[PDB]
Amino acid sequence: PDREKALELAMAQIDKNFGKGSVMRLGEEVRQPISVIPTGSISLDVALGIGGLPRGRVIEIYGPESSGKTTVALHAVANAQAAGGIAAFIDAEHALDPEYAKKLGVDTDSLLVSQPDTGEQALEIADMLVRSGALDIIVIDSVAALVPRAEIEGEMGDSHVGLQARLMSQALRKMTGALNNSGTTAIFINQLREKIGETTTGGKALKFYASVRLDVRRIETLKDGTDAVGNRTRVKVVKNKVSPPFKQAEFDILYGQGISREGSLIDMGVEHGFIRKSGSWFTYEGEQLGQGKENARKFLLENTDVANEIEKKIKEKLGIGAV
Numbered sequence: 515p516d517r518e519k520a521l522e523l524a525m526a527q528i529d530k531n532f533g534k535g536s537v538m539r540l541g542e543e544v545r546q547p548i549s550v551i552p553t554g555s556i557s558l559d560v561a562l563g564i565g566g567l568p569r570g571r572v573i574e575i576y577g578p579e580s581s582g583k584t585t586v587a588l589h590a591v592a593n594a595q596a597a598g599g600i601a602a603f604i605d606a607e608h609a610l611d612p613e614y615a616k617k618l619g620v621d622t623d624s625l626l627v628s629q630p631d632t633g634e635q636a637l638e639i640a641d642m643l644v645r646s647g648a649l650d651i652i653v654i655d656s657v658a659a660l661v662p663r664a665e666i667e668g669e670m671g672d673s674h675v676g677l678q679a680r681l682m683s684q685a686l687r688k689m690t691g692a693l694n695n696s697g698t699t700a701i702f703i704n705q706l707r708e709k710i711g712e713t714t715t716g717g718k719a720l721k722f723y724a725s726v727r728l729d730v731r732r733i734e735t736l737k738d739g740t741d742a743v744g745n746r747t748r749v750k751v752v753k754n755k756v757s758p759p760f761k762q763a764e765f766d767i768l769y770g771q772g773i774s775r776e777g778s779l780i781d782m783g784v785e786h787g788f789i790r791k792s793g794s795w796f797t798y799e800g801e802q803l804g805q806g807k808e809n810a811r812k813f814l815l816e817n818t819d820v821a822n823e824i825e826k827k828i829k830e831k832l833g834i835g836a837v
């Protein structure tokens with residue numbers, strides 16, 4: 515017996531029977547193009563292994579409110595649009611701020627929005643839009659807000675049943691195939707609430723249907739020195755059927771703004787040694803970026819020439835023109 519050979523032969527059958535990515539080595543150096551929608555976060559794109567959210571798949575972005583989920587979802591929509599894509603937003607929360615969305619580059623006018631009467635209706639409308647093949651991306655707001663018609667209308671069986679989960683099951687069971695054929699990426703936003711208790715009724719069916727699952731979370735409030743703007747987010751790719759999972763990314767979303775490009779450039783620039791972080795100060799090839807991630811953030815903002823050559827250097831070192 516020759517283990518490594520016997521193994522590849524197994525993995526081969528494993529994948530052929532259940533799909534590419536059925537099994538893989540955490541340390542894999544992946545080489546499949548696989549059309550993506552840039553998360554709006556460079557770090558998150560790399561963490562995903564394919565440079566963004568896979569197209570034609572079900573994506574779940576779960577986490578506590580205010581952790582950055584909708585922002586990513588919105589940045590994704592903006593990116594799909596820029597590539598001449600058509601986006602749809604199934605809204606069951608009534609929270610979306612189109613203004614903030616425009617700010618993230620979303621063309622709100624061409625954005626389809628639906629505000630369903632019941633959970634059923636909501637997924638059914640999503641399913642219809644999907645199989646028309648016209649959509650590149652479709653975001654469903656709040657997994658939990660997809661409450662069953664029967665619950666919406668007064669219907670007390672004292673204890674009723676576990677219907678909403680089945681609602682998300684049967685719905686994903688028939689949508690996935692269409693998404694695959696259509697190539698539309700379905701992002702489900704899962705707002706986790708209530709202090710204590712990866713799921714929200716349908717998030718249990720979502721757990722198995724998703725090809726990518728993002729654990730978004732707020733880990734820090736950004737500052738100067740008691741000055742704030744917005745917080746830093748940490749995302750954990752807990753499920754990745756297209757690349758080795760369990761990776762992580764971080765980024766800053768300043769208040770009123772989306773993901774800070776410059777921030778990502780400083781972060782990755784340092785960890786990838788392109789920019790030199792000497793204690794309090796930041797430097798890029800002799801040039802002083804300033805003392806304080808913010809000043810450096812600002813510096814990079816003003817000197818667009820730098821940043822771009824830095825972005826270039828980081829981009830090259832990682833994801834370049836493949837195939």
Ligand SMILES: Nc1ncnc2c1ncn2[C@@H]1O[C@H](COP(=O)(O)OP(=O)(O)O)[C@@H](O)[C@H]1O
Nearest residue numbers: 579580581582583584585611614744768769770
């Ligand atoms: N409508 C808005 N106006 C200004 N800033 C916003 C707005 N929505 C979101 N933000 C910024 O994005 C951050 C994350 O918000 P969001 O991603 O919508 O929360 P969630 O994780 O529940 O989807 C907010 O803390 C804020 O920094």
